[model samples]
Target chain A: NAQAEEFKKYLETNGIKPKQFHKKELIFNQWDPQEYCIFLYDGITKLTSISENGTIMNLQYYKGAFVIMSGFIDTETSVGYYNLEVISEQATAYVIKINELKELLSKNLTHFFYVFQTLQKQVSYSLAKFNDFSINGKLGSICGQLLILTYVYGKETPDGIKITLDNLTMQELGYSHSSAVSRIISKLKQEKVIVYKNSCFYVQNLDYLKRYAPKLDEWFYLACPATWGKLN
Target chain B: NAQAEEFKKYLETNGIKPKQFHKKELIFNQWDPQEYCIFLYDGITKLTSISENGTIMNLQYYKGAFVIMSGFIDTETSVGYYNLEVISEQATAYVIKINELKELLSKNLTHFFYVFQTLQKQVSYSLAKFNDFSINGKLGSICGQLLILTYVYGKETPDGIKITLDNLTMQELAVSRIISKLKQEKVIVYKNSCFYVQNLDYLKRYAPKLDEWFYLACPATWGKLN
Candidate 1:
């Protein structure tokens, strides 16, 4: 709880207030230099980008995290096709204008360090996901993704960590082949690594899941505890 | 040519001198706060990260480009297994310490803007490649990678735009699977360490209607590199 309290103190001391949003709100679409940076206050959010073929990719889940738009502060001529959407019933964020954030960062070295490190952690996790998908077969890659989501976004439960997953959610997560997704979910459940009910996945044994997909633990932990530990 | 000259002038104005490296030199390994940023000056370089199994993924080629290690500059407790190596016989780069680079950027808004833009362009192009590989099948992904290589590093020759490829080199590029490499070689001639294509127009006509390949040859269009 010290981690959460520390971040809360930082925000309050800096006069950064959180803004609340309703369920299913469109946070923003694409990365533009003129955009604002989002710091997740509460609830969950799904970030994604669309391919030219209209398929959504870059599926990421964020909670209690700093979701700076790489397209915004990157100050580069870079363009991002990604969108952020509220996945929880109600979500809140601390939104700051890109220019204002830059000014604040220039003035405060501590805040600058926190913000830059946060952005880099996000990038590393994303890179790890890309590498996971590249090395494994279809089912194994899906398992890898599930492992990442469980660790990064899963909520604590008496049984184990719980994450939401379904057929449609799989498609949104970039598993385009619906049939393969169904098969993989079934296989994972059958193997007892996951227990599915009411459209949510209760990870029965994380170690078992990691064994099935060895690279998952390596990729998930490679970013180190300083980054993902904030999620807890 | 003008773009290269402008970059050279900017470096000179800022007192950024290039550092020469021999073939097979290690640029930087993993992301450490103490690492220097590399701005590729000449020859070719490969970016790679090792997996737990010691297999290298994240294979990327850079020539006449800036390879900013976001993993490095992003000095959180973050750790990266990625490494940059000089793949050509000799390579040169404008190496600046991370702190010095950040200080320079803080003082010069114009330099800051240029550096950030260059870094973002590299990120976008890399993202495009990942997406390209995701949607396409094996052969198609390989084709997509080939198109990207031709555009970013290809040399203009009278016969065609020449790029390098070989069994040894493909492995370095993460194209170790020889079948697709062989398939491309049959269509494109291989001479020594280089492979040649007729022109940009020829590549544009390749794998028609493959929507995933649309972003393949258009690397420059993916980001506002300017």
Candidate 2:
């Protein structure tokens, strides 16, 4: 993402070091007070919160993403309130202390603007989620989530548009419970809306996917008239 | 809110004019390209979308809030993609053009931080929404929303902690459809999880996790700028 790339320039200019971690290493956990901003320029991380019952809920996969490592600027301090685990074989990121970041932001407008853009992405994406859920409910929410993934991560292939995300992709993407989404994914497959091949989703028909979330074109920032329009 | 107060300082420092709007007026519309940043420092407004059929869905109330106003800095330009309405008797805000605001932010570090802080509030709140909805489903999401309103807009009154938000309170809150949330609200009221005693702020029996989220979303974290 350009935001991540430009943010890298600021980190380089400021002399912040890039830290490396292997698979399953925690960049940070909920129990610890998050003092530094972790900008994951390479690899993937999962943001999941565990309930008191010890079952993890809503695992969000972030690939080359920015984590909201601390609280709003004014808070004395804050926690991740969720675990950020490196799920890639190897990951690298620049870690900067919150105080140091604050001071840097105070002086570096370029860095501050990029940081806000990265943070605003979450708000913008969530607004779409909230709006989709409001318009279409859970099923629509699920479909919109997939369509967005396809938009962001899919590449065209001989068969169809293939999603680059890994196994249980939707589960890791937007699952609250596997059973419900698992059934829905089955339904989608049965209808030939999507096919799971080589551990990725190959969307067969964008039109069919659009049926699940009709209002998505308006909010998802997708407007490919040649490809997206003229579909029933 | 201190965020609003402090942000106003920057406006005054930069000489950005405060524009006045009245009840039932639109700050902007979905069709128009949103060209300015609206920092609503006073009164109430609603962020709402209308379907092709023209029925409004999921109205969000913002009192002294900052509207998203435009796209991510990279998008060449953007629209509101929703309607922002002045629902209060009157409202006042500082309207700065996005390009101009970008230039001002480039030179003004203090203003930039407050801007980012305000923008982060939405992301943080949405994170909680996504998490709660995942954990508790629609019911959990509803409870957390009401609980949050009480946390932000409640007063300790003679009867109980009374919510300051007016009629259709929960409706204007986290509701997708009036009927669904209306039913749930009835269930919650009867269950005494939420009482309407002079519209009391007596929010209780919520998930322990929600307690943590409320303070995390508090004015202390979000702030009052002196």
Candidate 3:
């Protein structure tokens, strides 16, 4: 979260301060990208989007220096398709105006690179999801997503890794029916490859769990899972 | 293509020059990311990946300043999953060594920005595809991909837009059994939605999500997108 701290210092010096958001408050909406950017410092912020079939797709449960850009580029900016909402009861975040972002891009090269890296990481996530969705059946897609979730929302513990995304939110990214995700979770648990404790996933056997997620190392985007919450 | 010319000029001045890659020449492999980066100037280059399901997925076809990145970040670099191969009869491209790319990233700020923009554009592409795939059916996925192909491999004509990727390649991005289903239902009947684009309007009927991409890629269609 060095980037978040550095950004906070810079913005504070510019008379901007970190703001507090309550649960369910939106930090960024689909249309909000037209004017601003956000770097979440702490607390869960979930991004959701609506598809053509009218399903609200949950992308990620992000916390800790998560960079959200809409009009990051010049006229080269595209539309924002996702709405970012706060899920934590209390949270800290810094929302910057697009004009401020323009100034930062010109004056701070490293800061701009930070923005690029965030976009790059998410791009990596999307492509990984796309590849799995294309080639794998529902079961395999869940496996691929579980591997990625371990990287993005994982917390290292004594037993193994803990995934922060719950079963409810997990279904959003599963590309399967809610029932399918639930049944698959138990089936994996039945294999003892994974287990659920207080509604969180603990990957009991990383090596065994990886057998279901093929070529996880081949993707360049998620290669640096070690730096997931820290940097990009 | 300005970025390509600028890169070519920069490389030539650095005692390197554009190299010719014939059809089927590999610009970058899944492992090549450890060694080089490619910027295609002309001729078609495609990307393919073997899925876990053992299916070969077709990503895109490019003939311009398509930026290929492997180790673009600092130690922040990652492994490459796709193999980029030449698709044109002959292609003009610039292959920079890992060391050379490092130098460019250090000495040239704008060059790095070009790389960033390419990543941004692709991120946009991937998310759009992901959203469609999650919500839409196989036909919707094909329709969504068709809209994006109209952006990357699209050529504007007096009649409508023409797609550079052919039906064979279209099958790479499609999910509807190579669109035999679409043709049987009169959904997609042409190479690039030329005749029925304005009239038929069936592609959008399936994938209403990628309509924004159409407006973003081709602003001329913004009015019609409504």
Candidate 4:
């Protein structure tokens, strides 16, 4: 809540008025990269794209994250497309046309600096998580992602940190199949590092999870509950 | 060349002067993020980081790219470090302090827009190539990376497009060992910067394992090589 309030104040200075959307609402389907950028003020958003071979690629899960469509590098007629949709029950966001946002930021160096700072922070955090996911094996990657989600969206409780997984499907977690995700989750559950009930995840032992793979301990900082929202 | 010229002009507008460095020079190593963002004007640069398990992770190879240091995400005491080194025989670059660059961009809306455009373009291209590499197996990832590098830096020739591997290592290309790189090279007859083959067609048959992979299909930016 503190982070959300702080972000609201920051967005207000940039004249970004928040807009609301219901769960399962279509934010936008297709657009070029220069078209616009979406900032989620509250709730979650999901990005998906279908490849030429009929593969549905789940690109990201954005909560309080900036969404940029990815046509910036290709020609005008390139086939790479993206879709954005609201994933939370209720969501609030600000849509900023790229050119207008650029113009406004140009007028104030301080504002532009902060905007760039925010962007760098987001990219840095994302790349950090991505590096872990890429370098690890299937089990490690799944655990790393779960830890990231827990840190990013989890709430504190007496037992541990709890995070909602209602919006996430096993397919989106980069599983080869349903049983693959199930098998990994089952192992983690058996180890007492995490527990799942009521479609939510609870981190039972943060230290155990971090130490799960000694080589990957540094990357597991995103899994640490205390560091949630403290990345910036 | 057109992209490089335009980038130079953009830098000049913001009072950024390029610096020169010799081959094998260390541009930067062991610093926290936000301290510097490098713009490669001419020649190539390489980024590498070591994992806790002491594995050398090749983060990037940049010819004409903006290099953002990755330590930006870690805390003051964290040890997720990175190194930037010059691989080209000689290099020209513009080093900008993050804050100064931001201030300059803020002063002009048009300039800021263009800057953002460039950054976004670079990110998009990087992510695309990264996606191909990630979704594919080792051989496919190496082939995909080579194809991407060829597209980005290759010079079109009578035979085919030629690209330099000076900035990359055998290991980074997903080779098992030094002998493995030599073995692969024997087939292509790779020279210093160019490979001798019939055409790009030679590459198509090498990584055929990736043909059925769905995620690898969308990143066919190399002119649909068959």
- Model 1 RMSD vs true structure: 5.9
Per-model DockQ against the true two-chain complex: 0.25, 0.39, 0.42, 0.22
lDDT of 3 at B23: 71
Report the lDDT of model 3 for residue B163: 65
Q: Write the per-residue lDDT of candidate 3 for residues B43-142, one digit (tens) a residue.
A: 7778777655567766655556766655535443653467788876778888877657766666776666667667656765565555665566676677
Give candidate 2's TM-score. 0.83
| Poorly placed runs, candidate 3 (over 4 Å) | A1-4, A7-15, A50-55, A59-61, A133-135, A151-177, A197-200, A217-222, A225-232, B1-16, B33-35, B50-63, B105-111, B150-178, B190-200, B220-226
Better model by lDDT: candidate 2 vs candidate 4: 2
Candidate structures ordered by lDDT, highest first: 2, 3, 1, 4
Winning model by lDDT: 2
Best by TM-score: 2
lDDT of 3 by residue, A1-232 (tens): 5666877777778777789999789887776536576778877788777765567776556776777655535454654477888877788988888767766665776676667667756665555555555555666677776766676667778756877665655544442247877788778889887777766678777665355555543452355555443322
TM-score of each candidate structure, all chains considered together: 0.70, 0.83, 0.80, 0.73
- The number of the candidate with the highest DockQ is 3
Ranked by lDDT, the better of candidates 1 and 4 is 1
- Chain A superposition TM-score per model: 0.74, 0.82, 0.77, 0.72
For residues A1-232, what per-residue lDDT tens digits would candidate 4 score against the true structure?
4444654566688687889999778676755444555667777777765555766555557776454443321122222356677777788887776555545544655545444444444444444544555566666566666656665656777757776455353334443145777787778789887876555678878665444433234543422324644422
Q: What are the per-residue Cα lDDT tens digits for candidate 2 across B121-204?
A: 665556666666666666565566666655666555455545566554333344457425544555323223444323212223
Ordering by DockQ: 3, 2, 1, 4
Which pairs clash in model 2? B2-B224, B2-B225, B3-B225, B161-B201
lDDT of 1 at B178: 48
